[PDB]
Amino acid sequence: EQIRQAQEELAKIATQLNENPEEYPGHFKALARIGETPILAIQKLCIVTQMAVYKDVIPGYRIRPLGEKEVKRLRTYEQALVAGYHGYLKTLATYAASSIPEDRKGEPISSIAFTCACELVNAVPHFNFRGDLLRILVKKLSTRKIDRDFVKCREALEKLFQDDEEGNASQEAVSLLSKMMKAREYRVDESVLNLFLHLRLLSKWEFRTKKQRKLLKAEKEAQKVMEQADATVSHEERERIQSEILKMVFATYFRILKARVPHLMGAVLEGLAKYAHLINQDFFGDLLEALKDLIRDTDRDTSRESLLCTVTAFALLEGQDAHNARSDLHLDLSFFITNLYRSLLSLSLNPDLELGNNKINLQTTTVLLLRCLTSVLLPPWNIRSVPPIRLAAFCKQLMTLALQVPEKSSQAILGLLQDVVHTHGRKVAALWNTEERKGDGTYKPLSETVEGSNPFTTTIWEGELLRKHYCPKVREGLKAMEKELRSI
Amino acid sequence: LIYPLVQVTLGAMRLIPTAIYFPLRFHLIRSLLRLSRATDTYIPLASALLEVLQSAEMKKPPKSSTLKPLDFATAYKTPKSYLRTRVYQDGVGEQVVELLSEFFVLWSRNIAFPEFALPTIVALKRWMKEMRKGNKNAKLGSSLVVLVQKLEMNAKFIEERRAKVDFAPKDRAQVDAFLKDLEWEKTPLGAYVVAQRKLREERKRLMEEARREEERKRR
């Protein structure tokens, strides 16, 4: 039919453009004209064929507008190519913005256009009108309606972020995403924020005549000096692009934090924990007191926010560079430790503990609590330097919490104390041997400070209740913990 | 087989925690507590009780009405009339006071009672300060203040009689022989719970024989 006639036309066009590109300059316009037809089958076919032809003809460089025989051949061919590519992008925009719903005969033109756009992003980022291409991608990743096309465009942007080695495409994509989120007032679905996490820039004797030999020598020295200059300018340009992208990313993170979007704080804190070592130093301190201010605002849902910020601070300080910076930078986590200590009881009586590769963005408050307690009691660095008073106070309060929390959370806490006693031992054995109980002072449960509560003046009595707890799992947890206590 | 059975009861009250469905939660918590008393198994329920306390109905000032006290032996749901009523507020406060009473008298001798109760005391004191910074229900206020005072007294009592017990991790004869020789009326919380058992009984036969005279008068 007309469909087969169109297929023959497109086949001729594509074959001619693959074989001899220069000799055929107007067949881009021929594709546009044949795609102008109003029947859906030929529109799908022409869009796919245009995808293929631009994919295999776009050069590895951009071209300048001429403005103002072989040379004129190339100029005409390149001008036709860019005009055609602009036309293809406009048509892709219109079809992608066109209404998806139709009668069911396969993938609609909307999904086909989205696939074409994703392939263009993945294949030709360097070429012109990357702005229009990425604008279509962002207009799709700005709707809060998870779809197959939505996940395709997320995958395309993630692939671009993890494959960009120069940085300009990544910069422009980040700028578009940032402006989109600011315009939508941060009503996005946290996937566009995880894209920032996925960013990569933030991580045979051929005879030669006498004449030829001297030339190839000359271009040898020329390419040597060019490689040197190229390396230096590449370093400088990468640094500048990284600076700009970091500026935009941290700006959007800080604005989301200041707006307190309930469903994005985890992702924002993960990004902060990931990139605070790549941002400056006084700014690292500023983020520490920013987390302090978030804790205080939550003090004046809320429990999860406070635990998220505590995990963020502890991970930030658990980074290697921050750990070596500690003394010089005055990075003290005493506030976070005391806040966790004072909030343990409220979290223990909270009824929503279990109402739920990431290291910060964790969906369950008890998981957050184990991350906090692991960072405090069992830090990766200076594990044999932890204050015994801190260890004992947290052990006592954690036994009380294990008494007063749901079964699986209790089993988690009990295993954490099992590991704590295995690791430290003699520092806390006095908490179970009553004849080593200290006699200087009385235990103060409702204390404001960990040291204020004298932890070595009390004994762990919670076993006589947790042993008759109804959960066999927590029962063998106590059995193993007491076994380690006896095998010290 | 108690474990599976409990799991289901926890899930049953956690399916939806709504003030409409408080009575069902109260009934299943009573079931769990009576199971705990007959067996020797610990059932965490202070979380559920503190939830119903820091739920919506028991904080905002109530609404004036004139209805009949809900019979918390025949309810699966609460009528739309009882949404903000002082009658409903008093009924739920009395039920909470009761359930806490059986819980904390039911575990009134374990050598870790203060370690088991202290979170409940601090939560109740926080709620009391919040509501006297709420409603105006002085009846519930006084009932909870006397409850928390008696809980603190029982915890202290455990302090003095446990201060002289040896509990090395390889020798626990004294803690295994701690308090078998004392009965559930000597403890201050035992006296508390038996006294309000007597008070609950007097109110119950009050209402029962009373409704009998109204029935006879109507007849």
Partner: peptide
């Protein structure tokens, strides 16, 4: 070790131990 094995987010599903 064990603490990490429980701090895995997949350990708090809520499956009843009668569907073994």
């Amino acid at each position: 070790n064990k603490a990490a094995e429980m701090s895995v987010d997949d350990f708090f599903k809520g499956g009843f131990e009668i569907l073994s």
